[PDB]
Amino acid sequence: AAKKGSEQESVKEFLAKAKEDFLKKWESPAQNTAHLDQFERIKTLGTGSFGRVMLVKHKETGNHYAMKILDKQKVVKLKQIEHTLNEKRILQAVNFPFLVKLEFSFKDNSNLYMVMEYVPGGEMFSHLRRIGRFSEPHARFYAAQIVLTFEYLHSLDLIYRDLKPENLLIDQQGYIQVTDFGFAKRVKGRTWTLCGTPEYLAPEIILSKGYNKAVDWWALGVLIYEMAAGYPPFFADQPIQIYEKIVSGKVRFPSHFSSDLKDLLRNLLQVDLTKRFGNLKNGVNDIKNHKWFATTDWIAIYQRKVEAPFIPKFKGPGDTSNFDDYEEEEIRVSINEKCGKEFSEF
Amino acid sequence: TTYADFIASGRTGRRNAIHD
Numbered sequence: 001a002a003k004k005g006s007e008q009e010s011v012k013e014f015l016a017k018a019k020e021d022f023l024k025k026w027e028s029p030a031q032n033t034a035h036l037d038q039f040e041r042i043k044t045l046g047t048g049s050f051g052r053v054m055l056v057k058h059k060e061t062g063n064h065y066a067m068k069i070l071d072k073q074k075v076v077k078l079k080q081i082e083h084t085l086n087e088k089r090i091l092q093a094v095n096f097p098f099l100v101k102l103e104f105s106f107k108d109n110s111n112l113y114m115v116m117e118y119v120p121g122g123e124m125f126s127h128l129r130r131i132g133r134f135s136e137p138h139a140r141f142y143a144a145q146i147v148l149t150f151e152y153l154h155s156l157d158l159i160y161r162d163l164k165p166e167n168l169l170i171d172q173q174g175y176i177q178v179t180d181f182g183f184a185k186r187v188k189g190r191t192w193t194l195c196g197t198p199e200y201l202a203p204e205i206i207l208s209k210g211y212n213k214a215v216d217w218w219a220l221g222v223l224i225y226e227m228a229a230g231y232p233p234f235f236a237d238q239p240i241q242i243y244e245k246i247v248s249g250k251v252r253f254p255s256h257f258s259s260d261l262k263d264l265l266r267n268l269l270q271v272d273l274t275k276r277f278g279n280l281k282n283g284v285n286d287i288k289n290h291k292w293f294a295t296t297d298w299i300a301i302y303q304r305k306v307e308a309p310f311i312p313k314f315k316g317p318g319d320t321s322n323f324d325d326y327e328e329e330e331i332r333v334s335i336n337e338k339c340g341k342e343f344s345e346f
Numbered sequence: 347t348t349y350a351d352f353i354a355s356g357r358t359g360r361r362n363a364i365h366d
């Protein structure tokens with residue numbers, strides 16, 4: 001995990017070039033690249049606090065997409081202005097196999113819109129709950145993709161801050177695509193916002209300490225646990241009870257967890273930041289070289305050459321049978337511009 | 347079992363993000 005021969009130089013050169021591409025778009029973001037009338041709105045794929053994600057059809061090409069719609073007035077009430085500007089500026093700038101692609105973005109009097117690739121295989125969440133738990137090889141396959149994705153994101157000084165099965169989509173090749181960058185932030189050094197999802201919060205977030213990218217590696221610990229066990233390492237009926245368990249310093253593993261898996265998780269679900277994997281001298285390499293990952297070919301994962309554990313059912317284009325049904329609502333567009341100044345850069 | 351305890355809990359559905 002400490003060795004710096006030639007494989008680490010290939011990684012470095014890849015990341016150097018990736019940062020070059022990212023910064024060009026970070027500094028000159030794409031803006032106003034489509035219009036609502038160019039899309040036919042089909043079905044709601046999911047919901048969130050300030051809006052919904054809808055399956056749409058692009059009229060000129062006939063391509064399907066997932067369009068995230070945010071009500072500007074609701075974003076403001078929930079004080080998510082800057083986070084929403086973060087989300088779009090970051091998503092239009094990144095490029096990685098396991099990140100959902102932003103194809104267009106635009107706004108009107110009422111809403112903000114982010115039009116992303118449609119990922120037809122459904123949320124990992126749906127599959128995980130239905131099957132119960134994933135086998136360790138199954139969980140390892142998904143986990144490896146998140147490891148490379150965080151290596152990418154962190155090298156760009158990004159923190160993701162909302163890892164959970166609800167935000168991971170399975171594509172037609174059986175690989176992962178990360179969605180929802182609502183809390184992603186570009187920051188060098190500490191930040192302090194209390195945000196994320198209760199089950200996945202690192203102790204330092206709960207305790208208002210100021211934190212960094214190590215919270216993503218803690219969340220990875222939670223994700224792997226939840227994939228392999230079928231339930232999260234810290235659960236209860238109320239968030240406050242969840243936080244008490246998280247800060248307590250105690251975790252217990254199912255008896256079917258392998259010795260290697262438990263050792264990896266003890267190092268990820270580590271309250272002591274000076275000991276948490278991903279946050280040490282060797283960076284992500286402490287994770288990549290842990291023997292739970294000994295069978296993982298990292299390059300093969302990146303190239304999508306590894307055989308996926310399962311391939312979602314696909315009933316032709318536009319099919320949503322891998323997604324839950326949601327109540328449909330009208331996209332109303334006011335005749336007056338709302339919150340113009342606040343979202344001018346969107 | 348821990349699994350049964352999870353399944354009977356109020357948080358097996360989609361979990362919302364928190365803020366503030």
Ligand SMILES: OCc1csc2ccccc12
Nearest residue numbers: 045046053066118119179
């Ligand atoms: O889980 C719904 C969702 C949010 S972003 C996105 C992108 C493609 C397919 C679905 C979704």
